[PDB]
């Protein structure tokens, strides 16, 4: 069966939309689950000793909207309290209730589809023997699939996928690659190269396919304790071609950092 909602009813009975139906709709619009919330303080909550009064705070928990108008929450002495929003649909008169708990007891119970009481933390209150010391609000998670955007501003940080690789190029050369967001790679030179000529391909292991660049990348390194330098050409096929001066049987320590774009 297909239950239609955002559609007009000519006989005014065809498509009625309920609290749970709209609740599920709102959750999809903002991209939230039963473990996260949408919270906004229109006026800062007052702190009177071991009590916290929410002057005007609107909360969307499990797609269900409710306003806290001068609602005081009792706090535990010298403890880190966790303020939870409790939604019990069986209580037709008062479904939403608040509680200050010892630990974060967010259950993530599906109330719009199934039965149960939904518990979700929104504010963390750190208290002393006398009163409130500090307050920290729970992060509002916005789970999304793909974003098309013009501009962005980040105040904290971005977590891009990281990939590590350690290819033994040969002749005594070791490379430490670190690829982030499948584009920028920083190659770290290690070991001691011996028995190699200019323009000659390196004996050992070749660069793996996820780390191979689109074009030949010329990366500069340095010989430790000297004023002499070298460079290696990482061709698109993964082959590492030496381009420094001809090195004999004696091995010289190779160190350095080189950045390149794959894309």
């Amino acid at each position: 069966t297909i239950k239609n909602f955002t559609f007009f009813s000519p006989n005014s009975t065809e498509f009625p939309v309920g609290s749970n139906n709209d609740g599920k709709l709102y959750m999809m619009l903002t991209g939230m689950d039963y473990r996260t919330i949408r919270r906004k303080d229109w006026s800062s909550p007052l702190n009177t000793a071991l009590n916290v009064q929410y002057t005007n705070t609107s909360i969307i928990a499990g797609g269900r909207y409710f306003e806290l108008l001068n609602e005081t929450v009792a706090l535990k002495g010298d403890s880190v309290n966790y303020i939870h929003a409790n939604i019990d649909l069986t209580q037709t008169a008062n479904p939403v209730s608040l509680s200050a708990e010892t630990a974060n007891n967010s259950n993530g119970v599906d109330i719009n589809n199934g039965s149960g009481v939904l518990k979700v933390c929104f504010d963390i209150v750190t208290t002393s023997g006398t009163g409130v010391t500090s307050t920290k609000p729970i992060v509002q998670t916005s789970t999304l699939d793909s974003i098309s955007v013009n501009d962005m501003t980040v105040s904290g940080s971005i977590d891009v996928p990281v990939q590590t690789l350690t290819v033994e190029a040969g002749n005594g050369l070791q490379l430490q690659l670190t690829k982030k967001n499948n584009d920028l790679v920083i190659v770290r030179f290690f070991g001691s190269v011996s028995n190699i000529q200019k323009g000659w391909n390196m004996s050992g292991t070749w660069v793996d396919r996820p780390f191979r660049p689109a074009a030949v990348q010329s990366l500069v390194g340095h010989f430790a304790g000297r004023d002499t330098s070298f460079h290696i050409d990482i061709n698109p096929n993964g082959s590492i071609t030496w381009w420094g001066a001809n090195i004999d049987k004696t091995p010289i320590a190779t160190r350095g950092n080189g950045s390149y774009f794959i894309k």
């Binding site: 955002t6 007009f8 009813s9 000519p10 005014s12 009625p16 939309v17 309920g18 609290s19």
Partner: protein, 149 residues
């Protein structure tokens, strides 16, 4: 549909308007703004031939009818791309005497070479709806077969 207090989505009564979530009666949308845009040419039973008088809007834009199946996809389309605005395109799907003529004034023009041969896949119209491409008005006469009557 008509607007009813408590049943429809409106913020009414005591300020600043109130709409209640009830069980079954709740909120049902009244209708749509500009519901005059919605028009369905309904096809309920399989039809064989037809005599349509097509009134085209824009010249040089493919003007003619297309047919939609039950899932909103196209199977057949009689579409013509004329140089000037024809006053009316006369189309007959009868097997014996097919007519595809664009009338302008008192002059009758043969529209067969200008027609889209790839889009016109079948003559037999199936259950679904008809869509008018670049048409201001349309007048149709549908003939549908019955083996025994």
């Amino acid at each position: 549909g008509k607007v009813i207090a408590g049943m429809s989505k409106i913020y009414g009564g005591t300020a600043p308007g109130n709409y209640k979530y009830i069980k079954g009666t709740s909120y049902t949308y009244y209708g749509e703004s500009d519901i005059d845009r919605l028009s369905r040419w309904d096809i309920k039973e399989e039809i064989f031939s037809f005599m349509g008088i097509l009134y085209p809007k824009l010249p040089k834009t493919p003007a003619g009818v297309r047919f939609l199946d039950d899932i909103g996809n196209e199977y057949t389309a009689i579409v013509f791309k004329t140089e000037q605005v024809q006053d009316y395109i006369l189309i007959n799907t009868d097997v014996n005497d097919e007519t595809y003529q664009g009338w302008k004034g008192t002059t009758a023009l043969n529209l067969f070479p200008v027609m889209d041969f790839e889009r016109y896949r079948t003559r037999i119209i199936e259950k679904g709806q008809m869509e008018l491409i670049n048409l201001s008005k349309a007048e149709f006469k549908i003939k549908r077969k019955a083996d025994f009557v």
